[PDB]
Write an enzyme that holds these catalytic residues in place. Structure first.
Site, PDB file in Angstrom:
ATOM      1  N   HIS A 187      -3.530   2.790   8.753  1.00  0.00           N
ATOM      2  CA  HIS A 187      -2.137   3.139   8.538  1.00  0.00           C
ATOM      3  C   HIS A 187      -1.964   4.203   7.421  1.00  0.00           C
ATOM      4  CE1 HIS A 187       2.273   2.166   8.375  1.00  0.00           C
ATOM      5  NE2 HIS A 187       2.082   2.753   7.211  1.00  0.00           N
ATOM      6  N   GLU A 188      -2.471   3.884   6.231  1.00  0.00           N
ATOM      7  CA  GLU A 188      -2.349   4.798   5.117  1.00  0.00           C
ATOM      8  C   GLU A 188      -3.037   6.133   5.384  1.00  0.00           C
ATOM      9  OE1 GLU A 188      -0.102   1.786   3.867  1.00  0.00           O
ATOM     10  OE2 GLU A 188      -0.057   3.846   3.273  1.00  0.00           O
ATOM     11  N   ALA A 205       0.843  -1.218   0.000  1.00  0.00           N
ATOM     12  CA  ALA A 205       0.000   0.000   0.000  1.00  0.00           C
ATOM     13  C   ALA A 205       0.868   1.255   0.000  1.00  0.00           C
ATOM     14  CB  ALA A 205      -0.932   0.018   1.177  1.00  0.00           C
ATOM     15  N   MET A 206       0.336   2.346  -0.542  1.00  0.00           N
ATOM     16  CA  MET A 206       1.105   3.575  -0.638  1.00  0.00           C
ATOM     17  C   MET A 206       0.198   4.791  -0.398  1.00  0.00           C
ATOM     18  SD  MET A 206       3.882   5.121  -0.987  1.00  0.00           S
ATOM     19  CE  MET A 206       3.967   6.933  -0.881  1.00  0.00           C
TER      20      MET A 206
HETATM   21  N1  LIG Z   1       9.437  -0.638   0.799  1.00  0.00           N
HETATM   22  C1  LIG Z   1       8.647   0.228   0.176  1.00  0.00           C
HETATM   23  N2  LIG Z   1       9.178   1.174  -0.619  1.00  0.00           N
HETATM   24  N3  LIG Z   1       7.328   0.129   0.316  1.00  0.00           N
HETATM   25  C2  LIG Z   1       6.393   1.014  -0.355  1.00  0.00           C
HETATM   26  C3  LIG Z   1       5.041   0.998   0.362  1.00  0.00           C
HETATM   27  C4  LIG Z   1       4.697   2.390   0.788  1.00  0.00           C
HETATM   28  C5  LIG Z   1       4.162   2.755   2.173  1.00  0.00           C
HETATM   29  N4  LIG Z   1       4.993   3.932   2.554  1.00  0.00           N
HETATM   30  C6  LIG Z   1       4.014   1.546   3.142  1.00  0.00           C
HETATM   31  O1  LIG Z   1       4.730   1.532   4.173  1.00  0.00           O
HETATM   32  O2  LIG Z   1       3.075   0.689   2.851  1.00  0.00           O
HETATM   33 ZN   LIG Z   2       3.371   4.012   6.121  1.00  0.00          ZN
END
Ligand SMILES: NC(=[NH2+])NCCC[C@H](N)C(=O)O
Ligand SMILES: [Zn+2]
Ligand SMILES: *[C@@H]1O[C@H](CO)[C@@H](O[C@@H]2O[C@H](CO)[C@@H](O[C@@H]3O[C@H](CO)[C@@H](O)[C@H](O)[C@H]3NC(C)=O)[C@H](O)[C@H]2NC(C)=O)[C@H](O)[C@H]1NC(C)=O
Ligand SMILES: *[C@@H]1O[C@H](CO)[C@@H](O[C@@H]2O[C@H](CO)[C@@H](O[C@@H]3O[C@H](CO)[C@@H](O)[C@H](O)[C@H]3NC(C)=O)[C@H](O)[C@H]2NC(C)=O)[C@H](O)[C@H]1NC(C)=O
Ligand SMILES: *[C@@H]1O[C@H](CO)[C@@H](O[C@@H]2O[C@H](CO)[C@@H](O[C@@H]3O[C@H](CO)[C@@H](O)[C@H](O)[C@H]3NC(C)=O)[C@H](O)[C@H]2NC(C)=O)[C@H](O)[C@H]1NC(C)=O
Ligand SMILES: *[C@@H]1O[C@H](CO)[C@@H](O[C@@H]2O[C@H](CO)[C@@H](O)[C@H](O)[C@H]2NC(C)=O)[C@H](O)[C@H]1NC(C)=O
Ligand SMILES: *[C@@H]1O[C@H](CO)[C@@H](O[C@@H]2O[C@H](CO)[C@@H](O)[C@H](O)[C@H]2NC(C)=O)[C@H](O)[C@H]1NC(C)=O
Ligand SMILES: *[C@@H]1O[C@H](CO)[C@@H](O[C@@H]2O[C@H](CO)[C@@H](O)[C@H](O)[C@H]2NC(C)=O)[C@H](O)[C@H]1NC(C)=O
Ligand SMILES: *[C@@H]1O[C@H](CO)[C@@H](O[C@@H]2O[C@H](CO)[C@@H](O)[C@H](O)[C@H]2NC(C)=O)[C@H](O)[C@H]1NC(C)=O
Ligand SMILES: *[C@@H]1O[C@H](CO)[C@@H](O[C@@H]2O[C@H](CO)[C@@H](O)[C@H](O)[C@H]2NC(C)=O)[C@H](O)[C@H]1NC(C)=O
Ligand SMILES: *[C@@H]1O[C@H](CO)[C@@H](O[C@@H]2O[C@H](CO)[C@@H](O)[C@H](O)[C@H]2NC(C)=O)[C@H](O)[C@H]1NC(C)=O
Ligand SMILES: *[C@@H]1O[C@H](CO)[C@@H](O)[C@H](O)[C@H]1NC(C)=O
Ligand SMILES: *[C@@H]1O[C@H](CO)[C@@H](O)[C@H](O)[C@H]1NC(C)=O
Length: 902
Positions: free
Chosen positions: A321-322, A286-287
């Site tokens: 979370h997001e 997820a992002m």
């Molecule tokens: N390892 C990464 N770049 N993960 C991208 C996912 C993005 C998001 N910030 C998360 O913690 O779900």
């Molecule tokens: Zn996060």
């Protein structure tokens, strides 16, 4: 003096104001099979210090701009210097514009470019995602900028602090929907050059970071709600997923979570709408793109008919979370990636708070303890760990930035922030947090800025008193790695701290500015009554009467494990705690009933208690109804199962666990009205899930019989599955273990026609539970067949077979024998040789097995080991450790289990 275009950090001479960006994905290949997108951008930036060079990020973009790669103009009546030349510098990912003269401080300029890139299926920048709807392969266009891939979609000053407004336009097929951070300006208009395409312009973003931009072109449909303040909430998914109602849970929880956070942060949700979108196979999970959050389907969608309660828990927490980020991280952004732990740690903590608001009966906040605290303590109790903080000047390259995203950043970040909130009190924490968000809205910070605002809140009240400043305290927990074990002698109330390492022989070579001493907040309960709070100062040893006991009294530290540390006692106090749990366990908080097990097994590992004391701490479980303490035991004993399940130890171990779990099984048998109705709240459902798992895997006849009856019943009525999704993994597995090719062939059929990944997963894993060698071998025979087993599932399936004690030698033989498929899958997709090796060698615990792993290593000549090269070294290292552990422990453990099994 190195040239600035050869440095990884941007100059600070030019700062962006605003961007126009127009993107146009071509979702039909160019017949050599290439998918492309085209773009045009204008960035307006201000000159801070004179300079004759513009340096901006660009990655994997070809430029088609007329003239040089950019056109440069003055804003208003600013003159602009002539361009000398434009060049791409690949290593540092720059577009470099050399000027014939200098830009002037205070002047603004606009730089226009036209470009194109591959719309690759690589989950980076603007990229393509392929999926199936019936007969048709569908292709959509979507984004993932995190961390340094915005520059892969358009040229930009691609560092989180260099915020700007963005005016996004998408040009797309006229029958597809276009989404971005902001609402569309209005209805789409036809593209004049070709009306088969439409143009969708989006409203200007707030001032924001490039890594949080998103835009998506797809056939997706949505379920909607308008919140009371007019914020439009939508869940987007594949047409078929929406039509099945799989979006409804996400929609249900989103409103309440947004409301919780607006109030929690004392700050209004800063956007006009909230889109969340479920993407098939989004590997990043997820992002938190601002206004347009992306998820892998199984993280956002929920099927009430097939999904277990743990799936439901995953959905509400990932959403929480997001959404947490839509303030903390997006509205106020950490200046640089070295402070990622604060952003991800903060979200990883408050996800439980947001989810708790949406599901207030579930006691979700408790789950941070097994989920994050004890999880990350496993890796932070190693010499090879690292501090939460990293000097900003050590984090430069995109690879170095990617290394910030690990267990320490997320889970230890969550643990320490939770500790902080707890010792400040939540009300005080929230005041400082609100003060921080208001002061730095639409700007950037370091963690020191948060400490300062927390200190402001502390200084403005008289109730909470700290032994030092917030910064000085948090310094202990952020600048050095690891955590202390706090040891108490309850005869004297002597209390000590020392850096805790699982390996008592480890050499720590990473030095600390603090000599691995912490300032430690210590809560405690005596005879079930809360005591005054205590702080252990930065000293090896102290004394307090709080931790001094009578002969018939007990004390217990770290209530609810709010503190990031583990606790040891003298043996007397341990026994007193043991008798309490034996005679009336409800005097001790459920989290602490788990703690006693978690800590004592870790202490036994580190040779600080005997392993029989850790085992003794499981004796109370025969009266335990609740999830977490049983989970503590199951997690701690899985290694014992791994080492001993082929040895004389195993019978007495199974017998002891059968004895412990029978009363729990009997309890649920009654409570669930003969298994016809699940318990009501989440924790009790989890406990039922584990109790059935434990009973069935340890050979309780009553569970074995339940599993056979239900699976018989399903086989007689295939379209009406009688087994509740909570119980499916156990019941499938145990029933296939009891049965033969009848059960196996049936479950295989059901795997082949499973339309849902979670259900396919369970079947795949249960099929590995057969106790027929020939079935497991034939099954192994399928795992390389992409017809019958998806390639992305092959190593998983082999590992599940290795996990079967009968399947161990079969999997190991099969992996060795077909290892000469490195020259067939270090090219044909990725794989995870690494995860394959770990799984198949996980059991190895004898000299003889180590001799075999060494002998296997002598196909070094050619093929090698690929992405698992490092893993194969870890396996030789872990087997040595296992050999040593088994020799040390085998006799003491066998005789404990014999003694306590009846
Ligand atoms: N390892 C990464 N770049 N993960 C991208 C996912 C993005 C998001 N910030 C998360 O913690 O779900
Ligand atoms: Zn996060
Ligand atoms: C970034 O994108 C913005 C949106 O396209 C640009 O602003 C728009 O420019 C349009 C065209 O230049 C203007 O629309 C109309 O243009 C005609 C030209 O024939 C004018 O006469 C009209 O006055 C105008 N129509 C209306 C109804 O205003 C828009 O004014 C304008 N849209 C806005 C301001 O929201 C930016 O110029 C562009 N940035 C850069 C640096 O090029
Ligand atoms: C960005 O520009 C790159 C360089 O111009 C492009 O990469 C090149 O793609 C070319 C064409 O697809 C390839 O050249 C040859 O193309 C013919 C016909 O398509 C093929 O038969 C040949 O196999 C191929 N040449 C060779 C020697 O194999 C190049 O392979 C490649 N060149 C370089 C230097 O990488 C990108 O396509 C372009 N990207 C986009 C998105 O427009
Ligand atoms: C999103 O929230 C909705 C509103 O809270 C939930 O809607 C509820 O779905 C329940 C589960 O199906 C229903 O409960 C019961 O369903 C069965 C069907 O025969 C019966 O036992 C009951 O008659 C029925 N409930 C009652 C009280 O009789 C509810 O009908 C329903 N509630 C409302 C207000 O419509 C959704 O479940 C929820 N979605 C998800 C995925 O969680
Ligand atoms: C993106 O669009 C916004 C909104 O139209 C533009 O903001 C305008 O900026 C112009 C020129 O600086 C000002 O005259 C207006 O007052 C602004 N309008 C608003 C509502 O703020 C912004 O300039 C655009 N970005 C670019 C690069 O053109
Ligand atoms: C949008 O338009 C395109 C083209 O009209 C449709 O995609 C075609 O769908 C058929 C089957 O329905 C495929 O066999 C074609 O190959 C597709 N064409 C291309 C170029 O991929 C699409 O179905 C329409 N979508 C919606 C949501 O209306
Ligand atoms: C931020 O929090 C403050 C404090 O709770 C809110 O302002 C208070 O609102 C209560 C609600 O009735 C009043 O009784 C107080 O007198 C207010 N205090 C002050 C100092 O104004 C405010 O509503 C919150 N803002 C947001 C956006 O959530
Ligand atoms: C990064 O954030 C800092 C704040 O932490 C920004 O500095 C502020 O800029 C605003 C608007 O110019 C001023 O009102 C404040 O006085 C500044 N606070 C300071 C300097 O402590 C800074 O502009 C941001 N960096 C970038 C590149 O935008
Ligand atoms: C508790 O800690 C105290 C130290 O503060 C220990 O008592 C001291 O032990 C030293 C070592 O020989 C004596 O020389 C000191 O005179 C003692 N201090 C006193 C009596 O105040 C004591 O051993 C500790 N008890 C434990 C660890 O169980
Ligand atoms: C330790 O954790 C438990 C939860 O496991 C806390 O008990 C909760 O207390 C809150 C606030 O009083 C109640 O709203 C919940 O209903 C309680 N849940 C349960 C299951 O009892 C307890 O307060 C925590 N103890 C301390 C000292 O913080
Ligand atoms: C660490 O150093 C000590 C000797 O100072 C030793 O006991 C130990 O074997 C060394 N290495 C490891 C890997 O434990
Ligand atoms: C055990 O302790 C609990 C919680 O403190 C108390 O409510 C209860 O009276 C005790 N139970 C029994 C059976 O004595």
């Amino acid at each position: 003096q190195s040239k600035p275009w050869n440095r990884y950090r941007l100059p600070t001479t030019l700062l962006p104001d605003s961007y126009n960006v127009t993107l146009r994905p071509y979702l039909t290949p160019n017949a050599d099979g290439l998918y492309i997108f085209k773009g045009k951008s204008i960035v307006r930036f201000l000159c801070q210090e004179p300079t004759d060079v513009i340096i901006i990020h660009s990655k994997k973009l070809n430029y088609t701009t007329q003239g040089h790669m950019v056109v440069l103009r003055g804003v208003g009546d600013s003159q602009v210097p002539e361009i000398d030349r434009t060049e791409l510098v690949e290593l540092t990912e720059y577009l470099v514009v050399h000027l014939k003269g200098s830009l002037q401080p205070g002047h603004m300029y606009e730089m226009e470019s036209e470009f194109q890139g591959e719309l690759a299926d690589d989950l980076a920048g603007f990229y393509r995602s392929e999926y199936m709807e019936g007969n048709v392969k569908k292709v959509l266009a979507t984004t993932q900028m995190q961390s340094t891939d915005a520059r892969k979609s358009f040229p930009c000053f691609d560092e989180p602090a260099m915020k700007a407004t963005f005016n996004i336009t998408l040009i797309h097929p006229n029958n597809l929907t276009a989404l971005s951070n902001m609402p569309p300006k209005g209805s789409s208009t036809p593209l004049a050059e070709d009306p088969n395409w439409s143009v969708t312009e989006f409203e200007t973003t707030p001032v924001m970071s490039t890594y949080l931009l998103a835009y998506i072109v797809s056939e997706f449909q949505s379920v909607n709600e308008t919140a009371q303040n007019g914020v439009l909430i939508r869940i987007w998914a594949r047409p078929n997923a929406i039509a099945e109602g799989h979006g409804m849970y996400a929609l249900n929880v989103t409103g309440p979570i947004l409301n919780f956070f607006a109030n929690h942060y004392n700050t209004s949700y800063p956007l006009p709408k909230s889109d969340q979108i479920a993407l098939p196979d989004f590997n990043a999970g997820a992002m938190e793109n601002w206004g347009l959050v992306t998820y892998r389907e199984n993280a956002l969608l929920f099927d009430p008919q097939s999904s277990s309660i743990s799936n439901k828990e995953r959905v509400v927490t990932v959403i929480a979370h997001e959404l947490a980020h839509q303030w903390f991280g997006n509205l106020v952004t950490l200046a640089w990636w070295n402070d990622l732990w604060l952003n991800e740690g903060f979200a990883s903590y408050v996800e439980y708070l947001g989810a708790d608001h949406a599901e207030p009966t579930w006691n979700l906040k408790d789950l941070i303890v097994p989920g994050d605290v004890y999880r990350v303590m496993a890796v932070d109790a190693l010499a090879s760990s690292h501090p939460l903080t990293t000097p900003a000047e050590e984090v430069n390259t995109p690879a170095q930035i990617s290394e910030m995203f690990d267990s320490i950043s997320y889970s230890k970040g969550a643990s320490v922030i939770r500790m902080l909130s707890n010792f400040l009190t939540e009300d005080l924490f929230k005041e400082g947090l609100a003060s921080y968000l208001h002061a730095f809205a639409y700007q950037n910070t370091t963690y020191l800025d948060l400490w300062e605002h927390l200190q402001k809140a502390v200084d403005a009240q008289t109730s909470i008193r700290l032994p030092d400043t917030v910064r000085a305290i948090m310094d202990r927990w952020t600048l050095q790695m690891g955590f202390p074990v706090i040891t108490v002698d309850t005869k004297t109330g002597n209390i000590s701290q020392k850096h805790f390492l699982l390996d008592s022989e480890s050499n720590v070579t990473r030095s600390s500015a603090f000599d691995y001493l912490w300032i430690v907040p210590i809560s405690s309960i005596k005879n079930g009554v809360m005591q005054d709070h205590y702080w252990l100062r930065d000293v090896s040893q102290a004394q307090n009467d709080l931790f001094k006991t009578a002969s018939d009294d007990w004390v217990l530290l770290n209530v609810n494990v709010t503190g990031y540390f583990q606790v040891n006692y003298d043996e007397d106090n341990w026994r007193m705690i043991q008798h309490q749990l034996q005679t009336n366990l409800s005097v001790i908080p459920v989290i602490n009933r788990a703690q006693v097990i978690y800590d004592s097994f870790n202490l036994a590992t580190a040779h600080m208690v005997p392993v029989t004391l850790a085992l003794d701490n499981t004796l109370f479980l025969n009266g335990e109804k609740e999830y977490m303490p049983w989970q503590a035991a199951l997690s701690s004993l899985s290694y014992f199962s791994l080492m001993f399940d082929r040895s004389e130890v195993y019978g007495p171990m199974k017998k002891y666990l059968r004895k412990q779990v029978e009363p729990l099984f009997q309890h649920f048998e009654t409570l669930t009205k003969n298994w016809t109705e699940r318990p009501e709240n989440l924790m009790d459902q989890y406990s039922e899930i584990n109790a059935i798992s434990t009973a069935c895997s340890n050979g309780l006849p009553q569970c074995e019989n339940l599993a056979k009856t239900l699976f018989d019943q399903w086989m007689s009525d295939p379209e009406n599955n009688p087994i509740h999704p909570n119980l499916r993994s156990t019941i499938y597995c145990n029933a296939i273990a009891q049965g033969g090719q009848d059960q196996w062939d049936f479950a295989w059929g059901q795997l082949q026609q499973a339309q849902l990944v979670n259900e396919a997963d369970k079947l795949r894993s249960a099929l590995a539970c057969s106790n027929e060698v020939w079935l497991l071998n034939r099954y192994l025979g399928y795992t390389l067949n992409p017809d019958l087993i998806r390639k992305q599932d092959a190593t998983s399936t082999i590992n599940s077979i290795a996990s079967n004690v009968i399947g161990q030698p079969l999997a190991w033989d099969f992996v060795q024998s077909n290892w000469k498929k490195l020259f067939q899958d270090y090219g044909g997709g990725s794989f995870s040789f690494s995860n394959l090796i770990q799984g198949v060698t996980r059991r190895f615990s004898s000299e003889f097995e180590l001799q075999q792993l060494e002998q296997f290593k002598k196909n070094n000549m050619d093929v090698g080991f690929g992405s698992g090269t490092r893993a194969l070294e870890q396996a030789l290292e872990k087997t040595k450790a296992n050999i040593k552990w088994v020799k040390e422990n085998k006799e003491v453990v066998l005789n404990w289990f014999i003694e306590h099994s009846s």
